[PDB]
Design a protein around this ligand. Sequence first.
Ligand code: ATP
Ligand code: MG
Lengths: 103, 279
Amino acid sequence: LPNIYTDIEINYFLLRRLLGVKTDGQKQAKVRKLEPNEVLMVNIGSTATGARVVAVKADMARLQLTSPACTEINEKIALSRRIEKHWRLIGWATIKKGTTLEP
Amino acid sequence: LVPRGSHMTLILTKNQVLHCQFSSWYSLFRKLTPKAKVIKPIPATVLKYLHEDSIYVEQAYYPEREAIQLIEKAIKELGGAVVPKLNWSTPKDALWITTTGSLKCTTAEEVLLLLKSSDFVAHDLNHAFDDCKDFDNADPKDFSFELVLKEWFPMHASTEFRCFVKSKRLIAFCQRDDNYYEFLKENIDCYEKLISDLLKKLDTFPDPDFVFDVYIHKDRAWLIDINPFYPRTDGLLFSWSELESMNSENMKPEIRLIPKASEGENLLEFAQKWQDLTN
Ligand SMILES: Nc1ncnc2c1ncn2[C@@H]1O[C@H](COP(=O)(O)OP(=O)(O)OP(=O)(O)O)[C@@H](O)[C@H]1O
Ligand SMILES: [Mg+2]
């Protein structure tokens, strides 16, 4: 069921901490809570767009994309945050609800 | 002392990087470049916001109302649309965050969102002097960051060329876009004249080796930027080993275009193969 969406409701899970091993022997920085009015970088398939976090419940988040994206409900997504001037992967999600551009 | 040639192993110097700043060459070549406004030094509030991690929106630090009004003032003075840049790089790597898929910015937030999500801009901020043997990067002399707002215009990527200069002589030039255009081969001699004549207007430029990016519209070869003559800047259709190997003495530059018949075309072609039997 493919369509063009502006706002998406995701069921997510975050990483305990960022990927990699620090050469020092030190632990990678802990992945912090999803924050409203923070622009993430979502990978909705081949589509890479920003997603303004408007609201969060538990493992639920309401994101409003920067421009319309082509997907379906139950599509697997990768959430990313700008950490240390790098787009670090913070978690994963699935589209549960979406608001179409015009229909 | 041994006289070195003009083909020696290239290195990057503090000065080379400094001369390539928008403010540095813009003062020199204002006449040759399309309308732009430079905010120097960058409002400290904007800079502090750029160093903050994640990208927080107003619609958690955000720049002071003073800077937003200042950026927005410059934008209306540039026709309402602008293309942002820090001292050297535009956020072309972050067009995915944009509503339109372009560097066009109307709102001061549009500018921030781009700069805040670009690794090229992140390079400007932290790695501008990572290759200079001249400077010690531990924390960069009488330097400051600048926010360049260039008046936006519908610019056709087809007539954008990257021009390579070694010892004040035009070494070679190529197309900037990666798509094929048939009309380029037809007008290439005219573009080559236009770009060579522009270089004549760049003799004031401090260094003898630089890469100047151009935009040709009508019978005008507009100067877009001056990038250093170092592998840091993309050689595009040229390898940086090829650029070093080129004769800076030769009167003719090497042109490179993206690659892809009538009875008349055939025998005009067969008229040249007749001149290969002569000289
Ligand atoms: N004023 C403008 N209006 C529209 N598009 C523009 C404008 N200025 C630049 N561009 C677009 O942005 C691209 C990059 O611009 P510019 O050459 O100024 O940036 P740059 O980051 O310094 O280049 P590079 O990183 O390749 O050395 C151009 O190829 C063109 O597509
Ligand atoms: Mg440049």
